[PDB]
Amino acid sequence: MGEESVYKQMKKYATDTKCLDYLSTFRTEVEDQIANYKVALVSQMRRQLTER
């Protein structure tokens, strides 16, 4: 019973290492989602001007 409990609780926490490489992806992504945000903001301004 002790072995089983420890085993299952470690299975429960096996996922706890992906937090880092999820984070790591934050800095890599947001420095691209912003360059693909400024473009959309420009086009937003264009669209509003044209519609006006």
Partner: protein, 133 residues
């Protein structure tokens, strides 16, 4: 568990470090579990070689390390038994504020590095009654 670490000599444990993995069966269902040989070799730094038992095939760890291991096991077990246990062993997280702040900062810095470029504003042409018409 006991403080009986098998000697890794081939006369006792044939083929200990021949491969980079160890395997074990766990519990009554005998679930399989694979462990890195380096994680296992961590034990043989705490192992004490003066003490040898059971036909001189098992050494003993130092009590500090053995009891640290026992306490980690007990903590995992009691967390399994309790209901208010943390969903992760990644203690108090306190770095979500900085993430929010830098996200808002990059967003604003882009929003206001845009309108430096999108407002050159050379000149304008306003139609004015009497003059432009």
């Amino acid at each position: 568990m006991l403080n009986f670490i098998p000697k890794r000599c081939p006369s006792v444990s044939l083929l200990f470090g021949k491969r980079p993995v160890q395997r074990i069966e766990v519990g009554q269902a005998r679930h399989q579990l694979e462990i890195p040989v380096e994680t296992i070799e961590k034990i043989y730094e705490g192992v004490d070689s003066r003490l040898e038992y059971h036909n001189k095939d098992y050494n003993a760890m130092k009590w500090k390390d053995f009891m640290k291991l026992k306490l980690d096991a007990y903590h995992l077990l009691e967390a399994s038994q309790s209901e208010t246990a943390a969903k992760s062993a990644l203690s108090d997280l306190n770095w979500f504020s900085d993430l929010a702040d830098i996200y808002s900062g990059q967003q604003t810095m882009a929003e206001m590095d845009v309108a430096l470029k999108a407002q050159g504003e050379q000149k304008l042409s306003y139609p004015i009654q009497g003059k432009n018409i």
